């Protein structure tokens, strides 16, 4: 469970995305699928692109990113109150398009790098700890909502 004050330090930097949502996301999917390129399978829409200069381009990623973010954005907003958020992304995520936890853990790891490398001035040790927290909770209540769905992950 986080504290208010670990919040604070997550709806802080997010603060700083939300002046450009979609150049975040753009940053963020791109390392995903540099870093994970398996994950890009996961997209039938776009998994045919070759190159970071194509995912630029691609206007249909740009869409993906500012749904990934506004989606993760109300999600932590809720301040770990997020029962009904999770409800349908765990349904979608576990039998429509099947994400693994583990890819789950990837963006995770995404989403901190892209912070890292943009925010110094909001992302900070604490700052990153607090976001790790927030990201680690999600997960775990992702996880026990596959499960209840019958989804491995
Ligand atoms: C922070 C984590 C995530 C959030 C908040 C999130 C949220 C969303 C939302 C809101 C949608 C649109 C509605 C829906 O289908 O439920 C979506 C679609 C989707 N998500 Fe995620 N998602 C996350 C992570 C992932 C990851 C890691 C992958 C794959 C590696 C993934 C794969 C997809 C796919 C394939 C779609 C459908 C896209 C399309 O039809 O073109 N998601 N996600």
Do not use: C
């Not at 540099?34 to 399978?41: A, G, I, Y």
């Not at 993760?72 to 349904?91: F, M, R, S, T």
């Not at 853990?105 to 927030?134: T, W, Y």
Request: proline share 3%; glycine share 8%; aromatic share 8%.
């Amino acid at each position: 469970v986080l504290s208010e004050g670990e919040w604070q330090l997550v709806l802080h930097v997010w603060a700083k995305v939300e002046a450009d949502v979609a150049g975040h996301g753009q940053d963020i999917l791109i390392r995903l699928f540099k870093s994970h390129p398996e994950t890009l399978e996961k997209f039938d829409r776009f998994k045919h692109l070759k190159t970071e200069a194509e995912m630029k381009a691609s206007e249909d990623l740009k869409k993906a990113g500012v749904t990934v973010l506004t989606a993760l954005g109300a999600i932590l907003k809720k301040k770990g109150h997020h029962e009904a958020e999770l409800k349908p992304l765990a349904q979608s995520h576990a039998t429509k398009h099947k994400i693994p936890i583990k890819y789950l853990e990837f963006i995770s790891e995404a989403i901190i790098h892209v912070l890292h490398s943009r925010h110094p001035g909001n992302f900070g040790a604490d700052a990153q700890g607090a976001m790790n927290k927030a990201l680690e909770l999600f997960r775990k209540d992702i996880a026990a909502k596959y499960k209840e769905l019958g989804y491995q992950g």
